[PDB]
Amino acid sequence: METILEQQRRYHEEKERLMDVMAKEMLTKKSTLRDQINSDHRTRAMQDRYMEVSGNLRDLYDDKDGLRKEELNAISGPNEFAEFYNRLKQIKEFHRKHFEELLKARENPSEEAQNLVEFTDEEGYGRYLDLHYINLKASEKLDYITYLSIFDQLFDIPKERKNAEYKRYLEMLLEYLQDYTDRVKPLQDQNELFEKKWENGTFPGWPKETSSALTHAGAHLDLSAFSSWEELASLGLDRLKSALLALGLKCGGTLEERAQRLFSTKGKSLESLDTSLFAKNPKSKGTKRDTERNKDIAFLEAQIYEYVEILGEQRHLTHENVQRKQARTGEEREEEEEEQISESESEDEENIPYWLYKLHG
Amino acid sequence: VKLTAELIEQAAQYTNAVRDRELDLRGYKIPVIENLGATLDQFDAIDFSDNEIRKLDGFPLLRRLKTLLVNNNRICRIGEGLDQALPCLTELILTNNSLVELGDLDPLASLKSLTYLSILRNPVTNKKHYRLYVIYKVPQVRVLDFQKVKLKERQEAEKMFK
Amino acid sequence: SAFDLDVVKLTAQFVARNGRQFLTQLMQKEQRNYQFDFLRPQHSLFNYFTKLVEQYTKILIPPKGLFSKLDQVCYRVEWAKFQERERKKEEEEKEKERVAYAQIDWHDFVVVETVNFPPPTTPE
Amino acid sequence: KVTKQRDSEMYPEIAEGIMPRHRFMSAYEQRIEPPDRRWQYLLMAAEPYETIAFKVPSREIDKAEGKTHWNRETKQFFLQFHFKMEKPPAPPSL
Amino acid sequence: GVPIKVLHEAEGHIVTCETNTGEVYRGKLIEAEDNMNCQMSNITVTYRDGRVAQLEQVYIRGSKIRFLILPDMLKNMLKS
Amino acid sequence: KSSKMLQHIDYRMRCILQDGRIFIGTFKAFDKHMNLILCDCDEFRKIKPKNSKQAEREEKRVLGLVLLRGENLVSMTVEGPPPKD
Known part of the structure; x- marks a missing residue:
């Protein structure tokens, strides 16, 4: 039947093709990798990163490449994302897959349908091509991801990862505090909290409205994070955070004070003299109850924390934006909005009568 | 002539004679089943007749797909995770294809x-006990090759292969 | 070309395990001129053959071993781009030279008298 | 072998073009037009400075044989046997 | 009404309709009247038990419609 | 003023239906009858979460662009601020 050798071959070949594609990409615009790698640096500290000079001059060896705009960088990053998905799949199936009389036996059947007049130049060309849209040069996107659209992932106010839109959450927040004493900027001042978010909470951490809000917000920040950095392994990050959550807490709440001792995150909101009473409190009916009811919230809070930390640059960038727009005039604010809009909707790569029939009769 | 998103979007779409939403993918010389995501799970039937597909595999999760007409292709193997992507598959027409061994029909x-x-x-048809083998290994089938699976055949297939 | 492809890849499949053991026997058994040409380095396609076999030979390498795996390939790309740019610049300078050489008075003479560099065109 | 020295530092124009350029000219054409001719000159030129010539009575000297990489620059003569120490401003020709 | 204008805009597009009784009709919107009366074609209907059927031609009274899902092609009436 | 609806326009809104469903979407338009236009709209059945430690979301369905008839609307509250886009 089907000779596995051929299948495994085609697999290794396709993998090669993909590696070559995303490598060509990383070649034309090194930023693609650089950008990614930099972020990775602050998540997995071990990661080795290139010489700063290379990053700045946007070069990989000798040639300094033209700087690209954000929308394109992100685009290609999501494209490379799907490519890496394909690759991972093929690698998988491959792992799960890996005489003379028969030679003449098959060579005989190869004589079948001799009259097959047709030119066949479409195996490596259709693949090479499948991973490299327009007639000649209009759309950077490969045939592989021809229906890939960033605007369906990023809103206009996010500007492909430049900012994160928190106005909406300012609204919900007003709805949560049941007043209006809170301004967009004071709300951002609140977000900055995220020990502070634990010991100086905006609201009581056992309040319903508050916990719900925090959930929604957390989810948003996380999706935004992975959305803006396709190239980094999402599962890796997730698991890292989860293990930090489980392992850091258990011995001492990871939060320790020389005066009050050991604090409990989310469920109890109490300190403890020594580690001893802390441990014998983690089996008590109280802590069982709380850790059994407020688990999801505590975990979500934590995620909001670490993801906001990983996005400090974006948080600052946006807060800045806010203050700017705020200090604009009418015309200024309008023109700025025009700009954000244009950036949003721009190509990622630039080149009878009755009165007459009655009268006539 | 890759089965592409663009291909699916210009494909005849209609309500067929048995009142189901069907997509027409006939005679395009498609070799590999792929990119079905773009149909958006909107079809009850998909007609892949007269193409060059080798393996019935590569489907996304399609909850509404109930009928697959795959006449005159080159099907020689059936993928293993088919129920995970096609949970309500009720009718499968594989006439005039290349399935040769009884064991190749196992994924159904x-x-x-x-x-x-x-x-x-299909060559597999002439294999000794082909009908009883299908009946015992795919008992959920009620009509096989346009003939009613009867009780006596079920029992007979229970002896052999018990 | 499906026929040619298929026979190349098949004889390549067998040639990969049996080497010339099954093919070198087939050539003498069947008697094919076409088979002889395929075996031979004269026929152009032969080269691509040497590829396929190698590839199959490769699949035999890690049989029983799984692969449990970008930045580098990107940096290589970058390099290539850089080199390309150097080539471009050079072409430009050359162009300038051609222009000026073509554009100076070779009749403004003022002579005085009348009558290894490769290792020298470096630095040390 | 000739060693031509240039000024001691005493807009991307004239520096972009590589060094100085040499060409072999026949004396059959001269401005004074006195009448005399019949020998070649190894003229050397640079934008600001004045041209220079060297008489070559011998029909052929050092005319080598495949000393094949194709960057014509100006001609086989220039790439084949010239060096331009641009850092010190010394043009060697042999 | 502003929503009504947006509905008429969806004529010729594939839309989904749920009735007051929870039957779900998906297909091409041919005509939408001012009172929300809806003519559609080549329908898939999904009953409350989950079963599906296929219909060529339907017309549903506006009052007995609970809601409609329209394409996202329309989303881009932002003045109001 | 007439503003009581116009205020909440562009905001994310939690709308309650007569059968007891919860429609959450971006409130973009209304009219005399309170027929509503809801962008990026999802439907919930079991709960409106206030941080339910077990889970917040069961029987959630993505709908998309929704026009709801006012006959079947009961009430609305502010769910979250406008998305910037």
């Missing part, structure tokens, strides 16, 4: 709603 045992199966004009 996992299609829990499969009730109408047609494998005529």
Whole structure:
């Protein structure tokens, strides 16, 4: 039947093709990798990163490449994302897959349908091509991801990862505090909290409205994070955070004070003299109850924390934006909005009568 | 002529004669089944007749797909996770394809709603005990090759292969 | 070309395990001129053959071993781009030279008298 | 072998073009037009400075044989046997 | 009404309709009247038990419609 | 003023239906009858979460662009601020 050798071959070949594609990409615009790698640096500290000079001059060896705009960088990053998905799949199936009389036996059947007049130049060309849209040069996107659209992932106010839109959450927040004493900027001042978010909470951490809000917000920040950095392994990050959550807490709440001792995150909101009473409190009916009811919230809070930390640059960038727009005039604010809009909707790569029939009769 | 998103978007779309939403993918010389995501799970039937597909595999999760007409292709193997991407597959027409060994039909045992199966004009058909083998290994089938699976055949297939 | 492809890849499949053991026997058994040409380095396609076999030979390498795996390939790309740019610049300078050489008075003479560099065109 | 020295530092124009350029000219054409001719000159030129010539009575000297990489620059003569120490401003020709 | 204008805009597009009784009709919107009366074609209907059927031609009274899902092609009436 | 609806326009809104469903979407338009236009709209059945430690979301369905008839609307509250886009 089907000779596995051929299948495994085609697999290794396709993998090669993909590696070559995303490598060509990383070649034309090194930023693609650089950008990614930099972020990775602050998540997995071990990661080795290139010489700063290379990053700045946007070069990989000798040639300094033209700087690209954000929308394109992100685009290609999501494209490379799907490519890496394909690759991972093929690698998988491959792992799960890996005489003379028969030679003449098959060579005989190869004589079948001799009259097959047709030119066949479409195996490596259709693949090479499948991973490299327009007639000649209009759309950077490969045939592989021809229906890939960033605007369906990023809103206009996010500007492909430049900012994160928190106005909406300012609204919900007003709805949560049941007043209006809170301004967009004071709300951002609140977000900055995220020990502070634990010991100086905006609201009581056992309040319903508050916990719900925090959930929604957390989810948003996380999706935004992975959305803006396709190239980094999402599962890796997730698991890292989860293990930090489980392992850091258990011995001492990871939060320790020389005066009050050991604090409990989310469920109890109490300190403890020594580690001893802390441990014998983690089996008590109280802590069982709380850790059994407020688990999801505590975990979500934590995620909001670490993801906001990983996005400090974006948080600052946006807060800045806010203050700017705020200090604009009418015309200024309008023109700025025009700009954000244009950036949003721009190509990622630039080149009878009755009165007459009655009268006539 | 890759089965592409663009290909699916210009393809004749209509309500067929048995009142189901069907997509027409006939005669395009498609070799590999792929990119079905773009149909958006909006079809009850998909007609892949007269193409060059080798393996019935590569489907996304399609909850509404109930009928697959795959006449005159080159199907020689059936993918293993078919129920996970096609849970309500009820009718599978494979007439005039290339399935040669009884064991190659084994993956159809996992299609829990499969009730109408047609494998005529496949070499596998002439294998000894082909009908009883299908009946015992794919008991959910009620009509096989346009003939009613009867009780006596079920019992007979229970002896052999018990 | 499906026929040619298929026979190349098949004889390549067998040639990969049996080497010339099954093919070198087939050539003498069947008697094919076409088979002889395929075996031979004269026929152009032969080269691509040497590829396929190698590839199959490769699949035999890690049989029983799984692969449990970008930045580098990107940096290589970058390099290539850089080199390309150097080539471009050079072409430009050359162009300038051609222009000026073509554009100076070779009749403004003022002579005085009348009558290894490769290792020298470096630095040390 | 000739060693031509240039000024001691005493807009991307004239520096972009590589060094100085040499060409072999026949004396059959001269401005004074006195009448005399019949020998070649190894003229050397640079934008600001004045041209220079060297008489070559011998029909052929050092005319080598495949000393094949194709960057014509100006001609086989220039790439084949010239060096331009641009850092010190010394043009060697042999 | 502003929503009504947006509905008429969806004529010729594939839309989904749920009735007051929870039957779900998906297909091409041919005509939408001012009172929300809806003519559609080549329908898939999904009953409350989950079963599907296929219909060529339907017309549903506006009052007995609970809601409609329209394409996202329309989303881009932002003045109001 | 007439503003009581116009205020909440562009905001994310939690709308309650007569059968008891919860429609959450971006409130973009209304009219005399309170027929509503809801962008990026999802439907919930079991709960409106206030941080339910077990889970917040069961029987959630993505709908998309929704026009709801006012006959079947009961009430609305502010769910979250406008998305910037």
